Amino acid sequence: SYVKETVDRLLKGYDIRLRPDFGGPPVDVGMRIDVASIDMVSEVNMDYTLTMYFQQSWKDKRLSYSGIPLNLTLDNRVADQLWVPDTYFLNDKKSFVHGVTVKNRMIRLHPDGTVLYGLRITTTAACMMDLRRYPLDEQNCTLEIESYGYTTDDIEFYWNGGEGAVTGVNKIELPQFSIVDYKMVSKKVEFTTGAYPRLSLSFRLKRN
Amino acid sequence: NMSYVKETVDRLLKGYDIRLRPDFGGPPVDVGMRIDVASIDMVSEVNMDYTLTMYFQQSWKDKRLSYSGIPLNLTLDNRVADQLWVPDTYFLNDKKSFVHGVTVKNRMIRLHPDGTVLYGLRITTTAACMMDLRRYPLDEQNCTLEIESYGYTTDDIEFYWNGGEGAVTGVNKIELPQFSIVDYKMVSKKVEFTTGAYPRLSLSFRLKRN
Amino acid sequence: GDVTVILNNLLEGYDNKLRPDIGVKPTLIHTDMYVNSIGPVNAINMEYTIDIFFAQTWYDRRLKFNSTIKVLRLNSNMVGKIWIPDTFFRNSKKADAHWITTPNRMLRIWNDGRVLYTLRLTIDAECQLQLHNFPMDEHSCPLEFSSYGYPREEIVYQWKRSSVEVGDTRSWRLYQFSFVGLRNTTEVVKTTSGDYVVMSVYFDLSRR
Amino acid sequence: TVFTRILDRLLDGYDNRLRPGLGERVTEVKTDIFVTSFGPVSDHDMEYTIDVFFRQSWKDERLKFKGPMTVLRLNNLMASKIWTPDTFFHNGKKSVAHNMTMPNKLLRITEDGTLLYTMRLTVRAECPMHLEDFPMDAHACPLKFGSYAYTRAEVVYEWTREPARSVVVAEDGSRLNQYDLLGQTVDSGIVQSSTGEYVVMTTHFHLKRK
Amino acid sequence: TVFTRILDRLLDGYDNRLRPGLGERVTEVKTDIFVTSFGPVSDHDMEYTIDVFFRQSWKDERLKFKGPMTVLRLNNLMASKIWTPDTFFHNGKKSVAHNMTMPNKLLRITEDGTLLYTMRLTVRAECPMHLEDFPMDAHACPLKFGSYAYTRAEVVYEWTREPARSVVVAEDGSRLNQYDLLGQTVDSGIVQSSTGEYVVMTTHFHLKRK
Numbered sequence A: 001s002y003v004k005e006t007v008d009r010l011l012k013g014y015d016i017r018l019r020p021d022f023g024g025p026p027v028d029v030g031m032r033i034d035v036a037s038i039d040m041v042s043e044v045n046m047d048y049t050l051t052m053y054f055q056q057s058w059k060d061k062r063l064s065y066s067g068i069p070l071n072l073t074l075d076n077r078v079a080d081q082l083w084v085p086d087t088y089f090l091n092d093k094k095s096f097v098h099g100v101t102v103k104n105r106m107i108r109l110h111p112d113g114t115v116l117y118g119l120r121i122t123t124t125a126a127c128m129m130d131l132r133r134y135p136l137d138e139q140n141c142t143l144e145i146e147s148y149g150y151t152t153d154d155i156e157f158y159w160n161g162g163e164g165a166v167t168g169v170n171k172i173e174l175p176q177f178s179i180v181d182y183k184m185v186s187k188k189v190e191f192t193t194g195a196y197p198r199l200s201l202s203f204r205l206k207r208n
Numbered sequence B: 001n002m003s004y005v006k007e008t009v010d011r012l013l014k015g016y017d018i019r020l021r022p023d024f025g026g027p028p029v030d031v032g033m034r035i036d037v038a039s040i041d042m043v044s045e046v047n048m049d050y051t052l053t054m055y056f057q058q059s060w061k062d063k064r065l066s067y068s069g070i071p072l073n074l075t076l077d078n079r080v081a082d083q084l085w086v087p088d089t090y091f092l093n094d095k096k097s098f099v100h101g102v103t104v105k106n107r108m109i110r111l112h113p114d115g116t117v118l119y120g121l122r123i124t125t126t127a128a129c130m131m132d133l134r135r136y137p138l139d140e141q142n143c144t145l146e147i148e149s150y151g152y153t154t155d156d157i158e159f160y161w162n163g164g165e166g167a168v169t170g171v172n173k174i175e176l177p178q179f180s181i182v183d184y185k186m187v188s189k190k191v192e193f194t195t196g197a198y199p200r201l202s203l204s205f206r207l208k209r210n
Numbered sequence C: 001g002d003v004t005v006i007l008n009n010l011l012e013g014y015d016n017k018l019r020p021d022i023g024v025k026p027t028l029i030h031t032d033m034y035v036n037s038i039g040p041v042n043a044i045n046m047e048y049t050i051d052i053f054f055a056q057t058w059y060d061r062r063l064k065f066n067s068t069i070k071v072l073r074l075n076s077n078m079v080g081k082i083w084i085p086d087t088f089f090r091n092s093k094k095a096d097a098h099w100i101t102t103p104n105r106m107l108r109i110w111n112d113g114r115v116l117y118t119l120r121l122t123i124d125a126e127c128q129l130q131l132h133n134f135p136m137d138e139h140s141c142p143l144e145f146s147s148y149g150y151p152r153e154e155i156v157y158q159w160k161r162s163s164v165e166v167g168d169t170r171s172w173r174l175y176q177f178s179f180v181g182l183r184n185t186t187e188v189v190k191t192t193s194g195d196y197v198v199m200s201v202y203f204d205l206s207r208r
Numbered sequence D, E: 001t002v003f004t005r006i007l008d009r010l011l012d013g014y015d016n017r018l019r020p021g022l023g024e025r026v027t028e029v030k031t032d033i034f035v036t037s038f039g040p041v042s043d044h045d046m047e048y049t050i051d052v053f054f055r056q057s058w059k060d061e062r063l064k065f066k067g068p069m070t071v072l073r074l075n076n077l078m079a080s081k082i083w084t085p086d087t088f089f090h091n092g093k094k095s096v097a098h099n100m101t102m103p104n105k106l107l108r109i110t111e112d113g114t115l116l117y118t119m120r121l122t123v124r125a126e127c128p129m130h131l132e133d134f135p136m137d138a139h140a141c142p143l144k145f146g147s148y149a150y151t152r153a154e155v156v157y158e159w160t161r162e163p164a165r166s167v168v169v170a171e172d173g174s175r176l177n178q179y180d181l182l183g184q185t186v187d188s189g190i191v192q193s194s195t196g197e198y199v200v201m202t203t204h205f206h207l208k209r210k
């Protein structure tokens, strides 16, 4: 009743093509990944297949509402009507958002403005493999999480939760390899075009 | 002046019926094929198929897309192909085909002051080839590629090779790792079904096993 | 065109972006599936494929119409105009719907507001062959689903029939093992986004 | 010019979501199948391949007109704006709709009101065989199809010609390496599910090894 | 607040399908690349993988503006409206324009009218390989690209920096395992086509088997 017109006024006059705080401070984007599987670490093709619950939370002042003391989990057909960051993966080869019944994509608004975003992505990511020690070698295959068209003067990345920003890794079992450790890396990467933020999630793979 | 051009382009698309072929209810309009063979990619005696990449070009004279002021052969964006009538030409023996989408969908829309629309496509066809495996060192294939309209009878459109023998270009510039092109031949044919009669251009060529 | 009158009147003032009981009730959904086939258990990728007719049933109070027809049968064209709950198979590698010849989406609307909605879905799930005894195999092969965005406060899945609720077909559906029965559970799994109800379906198999 | 006024009239008041005669007669869909090439039978996957011109025809009382032409060979963009049946193959695994320069569909609306909507498909479906007699056996590969959302009280499928003369295999249409397509046998049938009694058109392809 | 109102002033009256300068001077597109990795060569089907940041720049005088921001860093949803050229790879037989959360495309409109536009690609371009010296290979795999529908009199491709410096490979990124990348070599040619005359940017990669 009352909720339907508040959602309709958040989408009235909304300009998707400009980010929050456009022409101002960088919008702060926090990330979290729930690792689902390390399916196919191929030694011939030098890649690994990762299924993950990719999650993004950022502040957006254009999407705040006064009343309604609850969180508006909207349908996934609103994310093409909202601004989302253009976060790619630097070392992907084949990737897709899962379309099981509908497209697996979460939009959960909040009464202050913190848009919560979610995806279920299966990523075939490539990694360098040193095959000198052919048994019992550690691989350290990573996943560079980077945005495409926003310099660090427009966005900032961080692992939302610090060390507890990556869950579900300890529950993974591989038949040949074994997860010994993982670590999260935050940095800035300079190109000819600009300076882009990069998150890096590493996986050392002690082969049995 | 670019302001004069937009007034004419909007004039050609206001009042246009995409679901009507040109001269609808009258004489059939002739569509001429033009094939520029890029490569024979992956010919395989396991799945009885071969992969063909080419520049499928086709031209037809339509009446509604004519203009008088601009002396140029007006080349528009490829998103105008989603706004105009193009023929439903298919390849009867394909198994998996796609238009290349590397930067855009590789389509050409080149209008003319006469009324000739030129339409190009960089498509890759995995056509099926029934290959006789009687004797293996001397295979001597004949792998065909069949151009045919789908939803238009021979009194709705008609096909021809735009240039006779010169409609097929680039087969002499193919370097296959295990095969050799000794001949290629273009066949115009009419084929009837229960639904109607359909025009059929046939692009065929002979292979040889080394 | 009398059905066109009452079908169009269910569309104005109807937001596709909001679940029906958005503030009041947890919007309980009744579900069941018809197991059409269970394909080869490969188990090198820990994968078995399964073809089902996955059905859903919920009450939309915005879709009550006055009793002119008892229930109107819809095609696959009104699914995009009506709120459809997200449902994802948690262990699915590639769960692809069947889209051939005006896709397999069935939709019924009663005058109570009850909505029956089903899909034809082929899945490939996670199931380890449990290789302690390679000739004497046993397997569980779960198939579980949830909503990706709506928590247990906002969505509730429930079986129609108590403790079975799942049909089956003639057992000639390319199974190299022995299909011996069904069992299903219901679990609340805590994640970061919230607490989600999980509807596990088990397909007990054994090699012979 | 004139035909645009016709087609802009035939959609005012028309509804996609309703079969012709809702709350009235059932709709009779006259299904025809022309097998383009019966593809290779995969024995380890236990599934075969077939390329069909899946034809189907039905009468709609909302698309009648009194124009100068009797049959209007319209485009496949028109077919998404009219009601089409929801036929699907009950045993189909990975059925691709062939998409090309235009999608391979057709729609010939008639002044009587009867339609003709054919599709070029590659449906692959289950063919369970019994390997008790492995080097020499003969079995029937089923091809069942019927409606998905409409029961026997909404739609009823039929064959266009006689059932012995409806499914037509082509002369050169055999992509088989091991088996021999020799004959086919169809019948009607009713498969009741948890919703209702759906009609199912069963088609068997009897074939034996070499 | 304000920047919404200024994007509509640039897009009202702008035609999405007309290149900047039709009937005027030739559009000069300035091409830069950045090879993020040089993927593994395939000796079987004679191809290689490469993923680049494929940069382009041209002056659209219809998009000049006066605002408080110097340049406008906009989404890929903006880039679907602005005219962008049709740059296809002549060797690419399969390519993936990557999208993960949005399409990986940035559009940066400067105040002057010039605008940078790049995309993250992956090109499975093919090498005509000479295997007469199979243990001691020394190849030069081309990466030809140019326009599809626009003639040399309509668009002209140029390199942004000096042409020896206008191609960059990543310092620590290459997925070669049997070869090694000796270095790059660019060239600029003209292909005489059946449609017209097209500028072609050629890029070579010199390899040697380890």
Ligand SMILES: *[C@@H]1O[C@H](CO)[C@@H](O[C@@H]2O[C@H](CO)[C@@H](O[C@@H]3O[C@H](CO[C@H]4O[C@H](CO)[C@@H](O)[C@H](O[C@H]5O[C@H](CO)[C@@H](O)[C@H](O)[C@@H]5O)[C@@H]4O)[C@@H](O)[C@H](O[C@H]4O[C@H](CO)[C@@H](O)[C@H](O)[C@@H]4O[C@H]4O[C@H](CO)[C@@H](O)[C@H](O)[C@@H]4O)[C@@H]3O)[C@H](O)[C@H]2NC(C)=O)[C@H](O)[C@H]1NC(C)=O
Residues within 6 Å of the ligand: A096, A097, A098, A099, A103, C076, C077, C078, C079, C080, C081, C096, C097, C099, C105, D097, E099, E100, E101, E102, E103
């Ligand atoms: C990276 O880029 C690629 C390429 O651009 C993107 O791929 C495209 O993604 C879009 C968005 O999801 C898809 O569009 C939608 O497709 C729906 C189904 O389309 C089917 O098309 C053919 C058969 O027609 C199949 O081959 C497809 O199968 C492929 O896609 C699935 C998706 O998971 C894969 O799993 C498969 O393996 C295949 O690869 C598709 O099944 C289509 O229904 C939908 O159109 C409805 O919705 C929109 C907006 O709401 C409107 O156009 C319209 O309203 C449509 O609704 C009508 O019909 C529905 C039917 O139920 C009714 O309910 C309505 O009332 C109304 O009448 C939309 O077009 C597109 O198909 C897909 N293309 C390909 C080649 O995959 C990636 O997504 C992208 N990745 C990112 C961004 O991460």
Ligand SMILES: *[C@@H]1O[C@H](CO)[C@@H](O[C@@H]2O[C@H](CO)[C@@H](O[C@@H]3O[C@H](CO)[C@@H](O)[C@H](O[C@H]4O[C@H](CO)[C@@H](O)[C@H](O)[C@@H]4O)[C@@H]3O)[C@H](O)[C@H]2NC(C)=O)[C@H](O)[C@H]1NC(C)=O
Residues within 6 Å of the ligand: B082, D077, D099, D100, D101, D102, D103, E080
């Ligand atoms: C089979 O082949 C046919 C080719 O005829 C193909 O049909 C085309 O599909 C595309 C979409 O894939 C259609 O393009 C759409 O056109 C509408 C018209 O208004 C636009 O509004 C749409 O814009 C959306 O996407 C834009 C991308 O730039 C964005 O601006 C925005 O996000 C919009 O939501 C969209 O461009 C095209 O019109 C048809 N052509 C026809 C029907 O003639 C079909 O998709 C193929 N099927 C497959 C590959 O499964």
Ligand SMILES: *[C@@H]1O[C@H](CO)[C@@H](O[C@@H]2O[C@H](CO)[C@@H](O[C@@H]3O[C@H](CO)[C@@H](O)[C@H](O)[C@@H]3O)[C@H](O)[C@H]2NC(C)=O)[C@H](O)[C@H]1NC(C)=O
Residues within 6 Å of the ligand: A140, A142, A181, A182, A183, A184, A185, A186, A187, A201, A202, A203, A204
């Ligand atoms: C092997 O895996 C480890 C982790 O498992 C990764 O090493 C990380 O490499 C990055 C960049 O190469 C470095 O991160 C740095 O962290 C400091 C703070 O500690 C920060 O100030 C810097 O800006 C930089 O981002 C660092 O060497 C290391 N970081 C961590 C947390 O381990 C990497 O994936 C693999 N490293 C090698 C050498 O193979």
Ligand SMILES: *[C@@H]1O[C@H](CO)[C@@H](O[C@@H]2O[C@H](CO)[C@@H](O[C@@H]3O[C@H](CO)[C@@H](O)[C@H](O)[C@@H]3O)[C@H](O)[C@H]2NC(C)=O)[C@H](O)[C@H]1NC(C)=O
Residues within 6 Å of the ligand: B142, B183, B184, B185, B186, B187, B188, B189, B202, B204, B205, B206
């Ligand atoms: C591969 O095989 C096909 C058929 O087996 C060959 O196509 C045939 O080509 C001949 C030579 O042109 C055609 O005969 C003539 O056709 C013309 C034009 O249609 C007609 O005017 C003549 O009266 C005569 O019939 C023949 O019709 C055609 N067959 C089919 C079925 O179309 C093809 O030539 C072979 N490939 C090569 C490289 O030889």
Ligand SMILES: *[C@@H]1O[C@H](CO)[C@@H](O[C@@H]2O[C@H](CO)[C@@H](O)[C@H](O)[C@H]2NC(C)=O)[C@H](O)[C@H]1NC(C)=O
Residues within 6 Å of the ligand: A069, A070, A071, A110
């Ligand atoms: C809506 O979402 C917000 C964001 O998480 C919730 O606020 C936090 O909730 C968690 C767990 O419930 C706790 O840390 C605190 O209760 C909240 N933290 C802060 C900093 O406010 C909020 O509870 C959600 N609303 C509902 C009704 O569940």
Ligand SMILES: *[C@@H]1O[C@H](CO)[C@@H](O[C@@H]2O[C@H](CO)[C@@H](O)[C@H](O)[C@H]2NC(C)=O)[C@H](O)[C@H]1NC(C)=O
Residues within 6 Å of the ligand: B072, B073, B112
């Ligand atoms: C515009 O297009 C027409 C049609 O193709 C061109 O006219 C042809 O020009 C070639 C020159 O290479 C002649 O060999 C043909 O005989 C011409 N055909 C006709 C029907 O005139 C014309 O040259 C093009 N003009 C421009 C400026 O691009």
